[PDB]
């Protein structure tokens, strides 16, 4: 009778039940598997952790304790695979990477 | 009405990866939008995959294949590893 969250069963942070509800109410197919929400939650949790680690490193590199959109943009653009993943995504309050052409430099 | 979001979950993940790091409201909204976009992309990929195979059930294999198609290389490999571990430990208990 004692209830227990499905996320605790799989040791995940994102809620399995919410993902399952979204899959059911998203008009994808007639039925949805039991392990698909758990798998999607695990993938989303891994992506979130991966992006947040780089964001925190960028924030620490700027003597800051609170992550700002600038740190998120720097973390995304400084990672090649993440840059490919979000190649068509623009982040508000993110700016651009510092990049100056060599030919423009004086010599 | 109440608004649904992933703010607290992202906060918990941040505390797990960085105990002494904060997060701003704008960055929280950006993270929520990114999570929603990835969720939509993976769900659509899985739905289309099931549709092409005359199948009406999204299983773990559809999500795996969607992750392989969408995430480039090492991202997809780590994601499939984590998903396999999670589903195995879930179905083993």
């Amino acid at each position: 009778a004692k209830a227990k969250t499905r996320s605790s069963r799989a040791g995940l942070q994102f809620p399995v039940g919410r993902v399952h509800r979204l899959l059911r109410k998203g008009n994808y197919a007639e039925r949805v598997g039991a392990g698909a929400p758990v798998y999607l939650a695990a993938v989303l949790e891994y992506l979130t952790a991966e992006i947040l680690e780089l964001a925190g490193n960028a924030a620490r590199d700027n003597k800051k304790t609170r992550i700002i959109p600038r740190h998120l943009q720097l973390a995304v653009r400084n990672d090649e695979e993440l840059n490919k993943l979000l190649g068509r995504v623009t982040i508000a309050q993110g700016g651009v990477l510092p990049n100056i052409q060599s030919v423009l430099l004086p010599k | 009405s109440r608004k649904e979001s992933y703010a607290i979950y992202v906060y918990k993940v941040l505390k797990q990866v960085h105990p002494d790091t904060g997060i701003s409201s704008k960055a929280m909204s950006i993270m929520n939008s990114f999570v929603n976009d990835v969720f939509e992309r993976i769900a659509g990929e899985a739905s289309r995959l099931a549709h092409y195979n005359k199948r009406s059930t999204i299983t773990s294999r559809e999500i795996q294949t969607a992750v392989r198609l969408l995430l480039p290389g090492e991202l997809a490999k780590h994601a499939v590893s984590e998903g396999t571990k999670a589903v195995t430990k879930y179905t083993s208990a």
Binding site: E50, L54, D79 | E74, K77, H78, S81
Partner: peptide, 7 residues
């Protein structure tokens, strides 16, 4: 193979 992110 796992936990070997190139970054």
């Amino acid at each position: 193979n796992p936990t070997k992110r190139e970054r």
